[PDB]
Ligand SMILES: NC(=O)c1ccc[n+]([C@@H]2O[C@H](COP(=O)([O-])OP(=O)(O)OC[C@H]3O[C@@H](n4cnc5c(N)ncnc54)[C@H](O)[C@@H]3O)[C@@H](O)[C@H]2O)c1
Ligand SMILES: NC(=O)c1ccc[n+]([C@@H]2O[C@H](COP(=O)([O-])OP(=O)(O)OC[C@H]3O[C@@H](n4cnc5c(N)ncnc54)[C@H](O)[C@@H]3O)[C@@H](O)[C@H]2O)c1
Ligand SMILES: [Zn+2]
Ligand SMILES: [Zn+2]
Ligand SMILES: [Zn+2]
């Protein structure tokens with residue numbers, strides 16, 4: 001069978017910036033020492049993938065993007081002890097080597113072996129596993145889920161429940177976990193608290209789920225797209241405001257609504273301006289603000305430090321602060337137990353081939369999550 | 375007696391910015407309802423006061439500054455219940471109305487009654503007590519301790535032990551408590567951590583006393599004035615670095631020293647650039663950076679949101695997050711029990727009249743805390 005030999009398959013290769021993904025045949029080389037080749041079953045369309053198209057998130061092109069997914073191990077490389085063939089797995093865009101200061105810390109999850117801070121677009125050995133039209137194709141976040149077949153490092157994959165609905169749990173590989181964790185793990189939303197979530201897409205709604213799970217009495221969803229309101233309220237938002245419906249600045253509106261600032265604000269969009277607004281909207285003397293949205297490349301935000309001096313707490317986080325490899329298998333199990341629901345995020349289920357349509361659905365604000373089935 | 379009548383005494387009136395504190399005769403009106411008039415025994419020269427002069431910290435002028443102090447209750451107004459004449463008290467530049475949102479909050483301390491964010495430079499009733507040259511002089515943070523007698527609203531004053539050495543505990547009015555709290559309360563330094571303190575002044579040194587008290591195994595002090603090193607080490611610094619001695623930006627040097635970044639970083643200077651540096655020096659995935667230094671009025675800082683997205687926590691606080699009226703008496707009580715040393719911050723003792731010279735020392739870097747006696 002396929003094990004031990006280069007696997008030709010279709011993948012969504014991104015050649016240039018701001019250009020459509022090109023579904024072509026790529027050569028997926030076999031897994032080397034401590035690498036895992038996974039047959040993709042379902043990949044979700046996260047806004048971060050679109051960020052690479054726009055240039056918001058700089059990474060080496062050409063590249064096979066995608067990181068939010070779930071699949072089954074085709075074959076494992078030499079030295080792989082954590083997964084075996086036929087294992088349902090979820091590629092972790094944030095690895096967990098377990099050997100670094102961050103992995104040994106009880107609170108940090110951002111493993112230094114991450115290829116996010118300073119993208120290279122390779123495996124941990126610095127090489128590529130994809131070849132297309134001769135040219136070597138770079139990897140995205142050590143995952144590259146936009147391919148019928150992919151190869152990841154052992155530290156960037158987790159074995160999940162064998163009876164898991166991959167088409168649904170793939171969201172745990174990013175969107176859900178991120179939002180959920182940003183709520184209960186990073187910010188640690190309290191019982192009776194008031195939260196303001198900026199951005200109501202896959203991650204935003206997931207923050208609402210986390211706020212509600214934590215017992216937030218009042219949850220305010222903030223989106224310039226009213227079509228996102230209906231769902232936000234469905235997942236926990238107690239109300240929704242549209243910045244472009246008023247004349248005065250939103251923080252004024254939010255300040256007045258919350259009566260002096262919210263307990264928790266979440267920036268789940270990825271804009272420097274809304275990041276400052278989220279900070280401002282949390283109570284000056286004890287408010288917590290968490291930045292979930294990935295900011296535009298090389299761009300700095302200008303803010304007044306007095307926002308902090310007064311007593312505010314500003315935070316940010318990758319994968320909801322969840323230690324990916326230890327958490328993902330645990331999050332899937334909890335989904336199996338039905339502690340949380342991924343269905344509200346799934347709005348469009350298309351074939352891998354329609355990847356570009358799904359992206360257009362995202363871009364038009366018509367979709368939350370588009371699940372590409374392989 | 376003077377109880378019930380205007381008291382003519384001397385005060386340090388700052389008529390214009392960047393001008394000397396004119397020691398002249400001002401009239402102090404008797405305390406109105408729920409107000410308290412205190413006889414100043416000793417007041418500490420805090421950099422925040424110098425800020426008022428230089429214009430860094432804005433408040434209505436002409437003003438009688440001063441906020442770090444201790445004195446005795448001369449008389450109380452109608453309805454005052456918390457203090458009685460003859461009581462040794464410390465003015466709280468940060469009020470504790472015990473009614474507002476932040477006061478009712480379990481961990482908030484920047485009471486809304488404060489006069490820091492929106493400086494009115496008056497009492498709670500919007501009126502002043504000071505008269506000089508016939509001109510009504512402003513109050514500073516509702517304390518105005520640069521006068522032999524000042525009128526503070528009841529919520530901005532706390533009764534400390536009758537056996538408290540006022541000339542030493544006046545440091546608990548701000549300096550010490552700020553830094554100590556910033557470390558032990560706001561940041562919550564863990565046992566065995568590596569702390570990096572920016573600025574080795576009275577406040578900075580107190581932050582060191584906090585990390586040291588918290589169990590911080592390492593404490594790197596940062597200052598462009600090498601002379602401040604000896605005392606830092608004396609109070610807790612494991613080492614101290616003069617940024618000017620390096621060809622590469624200090625944050626890098628700090629990251630290198632701590633093997634990836636510090637656990638807790640502190641900014642006790644008040645510069646925008648140093649704030650960004652302190653944040654960047656703490657470990658990107660679990661670093662906590664606490665800003666204490668007051669920034670130049672209306673000035674914004676440009677920072678990279680990725681510093682936060684990775685996992686850093688950035689926060690600030692006024693008075694070390696301590697609920698003034700609550701903590702203050704206890705902090706004095708701890709000093710009574712020899713729980714922390716105040717002496718190390720006291721380098722010069724000068725009579726109130728030699729006020730300018732005290733500011734000279736500060737500005738020349740020849741001092742930490744110059745205690746003014748009356
Ligand atoms: N740090 C992490 O671990 C992590 C994980 C997942 C996603 N993200 C990031 O979070 C952000 C959102 O992800 P998503 O999949 O939910 O995206 P999305 O496109 O589904 O949602 C973004 C939402 O914010 C709204 N919005 C845009 N501008 C707005 C504005 N000016 N005011 C108010 N609302 C506005 C949009 O209408 C949209 O609903 C992205 O930047 C993504 O890259 C980060
Ligand atoms: N947040 C609060 O409630 C609060 C309370 C007290 C003081 N403060 C503020 O904290 C700051 C410091 O207070 P302080 O009382 O310790 O004063 P200070 O002047 O004695 O301390 C400042 C120290 O930092 C050093 N320094 C200056 N520039 C530096 C630089 N570029 N790099 C490194 N070191 C540098 C100075 O040499 C000095 O030793 C002030 O801005 C003050 O207003 C805030
Ligand atoms: Zn690691
Ligand atoms: Zn994502
Ligand atoms: Zn209050």
Ligand SMILES: [Zn+2]
Nearest residue numbers: 420422548549
């Ligand atoms: Zn002070």
